[PDB]
From a paper:
Among the classes of 2D particle images, the images representing the top views or bottom views exhibited seven obvious subunits in each detergent micelle. The model we built contained an almost intact extracellular region, transmembrane domain, and partial intracellular region. Three fractions (N-terminal, 1–12; 158–193, between TM2 and TM3; and C-terminal, 355–426) were missing in the final model. I58 from the tail of TM1 forms a larger hydrophobic ring. However, disordered CT tails are missing in the structure of full-length PANX1.
As suggested by biochemical analysis, PANX1 forms an oligomeric channel for the facilitated diffusion of ions and large molecules across the plasma membrane upon activation. The overall structure of human PANX1 presents a novel heptameric assembly, which is distinct from gap junction channels (connexins and innexins)8,9 and functionally related channels, such as CALHM and LRRC8. Interestingly, the protomer of PANX1 shares a similar fold of four transmembrane helices with the aforementioned channels.
Author numbering:
A (entry chain A): 12 to 158, 194 to 354
B (entry chain D): 50 to 97
C (entry chain F): 50 to 146
D (entry chain F): 195 to 291
The structure:
């Protein structure tokens, strides 16, 4: 009990706070930023050196007939009419549309943070600002006496489940999308065959019953050997990222019930009630506050007291 | 639309016709341009 | 990497093979594309003692960019994990002095 | 009050281990990049030339394709120079770390 500095009231408070946790923004950062990076690198090298397909046409063909054979056999991996590799026809379908599927997973790994921004941002923002102003004002009356409203609010949030289920649902959606991307990339690398080569035929329309076109063409898909490398490194990153996402589901486990242990030195609080050990909104606030304690200077001023 | 335009301007044209080998390059380009511009009018397309 | 990509897209391709004179233009382009795409699989390359150098020569800029990315994550972790604590403690000790 | 705060920080280890772990991660990534670039320059052979073959699918049992092709990788001689200067810079940077 001595003299300590009082806190002036200021209106521009906290310069905007952390509406997301630390490791969750990092996880969505890496999990959306990796496949877009791989897609951009693949498109740069593909538009630099090479086409997507190349077929071996006879020497008596002109240039435009060889270009027709390339365009026809590129456009005819969809329909299963005559490709002579129907056991691996679905790999031939996947080899054309791999970057579209990778970009689709990159888009679907972005919607749960957008829903968290449009649905859970201003409620947690206003509640954090209110509890911070309440702590800042309840510290100022402590030194004037030396010259419980939060204890009921933390009971109010004890019996409510309206934000923790939203947080858990967003994390579970992110986890199952991660697992589906993992099994898809594992399958696409696990084909791994000589499935880039196939046999195409152009005798379909009035070119049937001809004697100039040679009835068989050997075609090869060029960009498969880069796609398999991209799938390997993306699979390795997502497998190393999955234990973090299963670790951030145990909300009452990775919390410490001493974020307001320092405030019982002030004789008015007697704040000891944090025996939650459960899945209430109090256990979510107990972790959303512990990262955000760097904007109450009363906490820093009280940190010097109990250790001497 | 942006993804389709990127892949279309990357790899491929819109149409390709199979002209005989005795044609030159510009005659094959004429056949491509003509049969691309003639899907509007229904004169002789055999798939009416 | 940027200088190498500028000079590579300026003057040259990545591979060039010597096809016979009776081939047309598109058959020579097929031979180039095929032998560029077939340095991965070890079927018939006749230099299997140095096959891993042939694999590395294609993917050198990817590996160099991967090391450039992995040399960036520890400052990002220091920014997301050790910045505001040291910031507030420095401001407090400065105001105290 | 500062004479007790500097005793408070005297018995805590929560930021120095984070700083040391970030520097050690940076050092081992630097050393792995150094040994990789050293190996890639140390191959240095005539490994840019190789012999390719296209007789794989229905082109097997043919009489027009000439069964052997001499191919050469073009951009190797620039990559070796880039690896040399990157290795020299990282070796001079390791004593600072």
């Amino acid at each position: 009990f001595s003299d300590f500095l009082l806190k002036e009231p200021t209106e521009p408070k906290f310069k905007g706070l952390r509406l997301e946790l630390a490791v969750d923004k990092m996880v969505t950062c890496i999990a959306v930023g990796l496949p877009l990076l791989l897609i951009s690198l693949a498109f740069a090298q593909e538009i630099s050196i090479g086409t997507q397909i190349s077929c071996f046409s006879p020497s008596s063909f002109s240039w435009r007939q060889a270009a027709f054979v390339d365009s026809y056999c590129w456009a005819a991996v969809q329909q299963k009419n005559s490709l002579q590799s129907e056991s691996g026809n679905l790999p031939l379908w996947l080899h054309k549309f791999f970057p579209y599927i990778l970009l689709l997973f990159a888009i679907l790994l972005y919607l749960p943070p957008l829903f968290w921004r449009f649905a859970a941002a201003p409620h947690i923002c206003s509640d954090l600002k209110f509890i911070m102003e309440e702590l800042d004002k309840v510290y100022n009356r402590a030194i004037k006496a030396a010259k419980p409203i939060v204890e009921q609010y933390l009971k109010t949030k004890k019996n409510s489940n309206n934000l923790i289920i939203k947080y858990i649902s967003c994390r579970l959606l992110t986890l199952i999308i991660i697992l589906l991307a993992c099994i898809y990339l594992g399958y696409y690398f696990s084909l791994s065959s000589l499935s880039d080569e196939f046999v195409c035929s152009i005798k379909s329309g009035i070119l049937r019953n001809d004697s100039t076109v040679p009835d068989q063409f050997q075609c090869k898909l060029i960009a498969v050997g880069i796609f398999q490398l991209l799938s390997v490194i993306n699979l390795v990153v997502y497998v190393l990222l999955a234990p973090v996402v299963v670790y951030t589901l145990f909300v009452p486990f990775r919390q410490k019930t001493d974020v307001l242990k320092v405030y019982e030195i002030l004789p008015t609080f007697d704040v000891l009630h944090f025996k939650s050990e459960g899945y209430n909104d109090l256990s979510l606030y107990n972790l959303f506050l512990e990262e955000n304690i760097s904007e109450v200077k009363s906490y820093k001023c009280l940190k010097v007291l109990e250790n001497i």
